XYZ file of C-alpha atoms in Angstrom:
66
model
C 64.145 62.985 134.852
C 62.191 63.543 131.841
C 63.194 65.815 129.179
C 62.191 67.231 125.994
C 63.747 65.344 123.065
C 64.091 66.913 119.534
C 66.365 67.596 116.759
C 66.398 68.572 113.206
C 64.477 65.532 112.164
C 62.081 64.647 115.243
C 59.552 66.883 116.486
C 59.701 67.543 120.252
C 58.556 64.702 122.459
C 58.912 63.773 126.272
C 61.647 61.191 126.868
C 62.577 59.529 130.151
C 66.199 59.957 130.851
C 68.438 57.105 131.883
C 69.106 56.620 135.495
C 71.855 58.821 136.406
C 71.157 61.517 133.857
C 69.497 64.305 135.827
C 69.948 67.200 133.344
C 68.144 68.432 130.301
C 69.914 70.297 127.619
C 68.712 72.971 124.959
C 71.105 73.683 122.251
C 71.004 76.234 119.555
C 73.177 76.963 116.634
C 73.099 80.361 115.016
C 72.844 80.342 111.232
C 71.823 83.882 110.572
C 69.588 86.503 112.263
C 66.449 84.765 113.813
C 67.693 81.273 112.082
C 68.882 78.593 114.473
C 69.054 74.584 114.617
C 67.673 73.504 117.913
C 68.543 70.260 119.772
C 67.062 69.078 123.124
C 67.525 66.086 125.195
C 68.820 64.432 128.267
C 72.360 64.714 129.524
C 74.503 63.470 132.464
C 76.668 66.602 132.370
C 75.797 69.832 130.521
C 77.081 69.507 126.964
C 79.608 72.149 125.574
C 79.553 74.001 122.308
C 81.292 72.541 119.457
C 81.638 76.025 117.663
C 81.206 79.592 118.392
C 77.906 79.806 116.933
C 76.428 77.395 119.611
C 74.831 77.975 122.841
C 73.832 75.500 125.439
C 71.499 75.573 128.315
C 71.176 72.928 130.995
C 68.613 72.491 133.824
C 67.396 70.114 136.248
C 63.624 69.818 136.445
C 61.269 67.763 134.201
C 60.955 68.972 130.558
C 62.628 72.124 131.731
C 64.391 72.584 128.197
C 60.915 72.954 126.508
């Protein structure tokens, strides 16, 4: 699998996931209206929110987390 990788520093790029990681994730954290922190990458299992302002979506096709 290949996923989009991005975070607060790095602009979105393609990344090849390690063998055995067959999900891509997109995670967003609400700050205020229409203002979010986004993170994207590969995962083995879908990550879970660390706080109630976070939402995560996972998917299983190349770069589906764009």
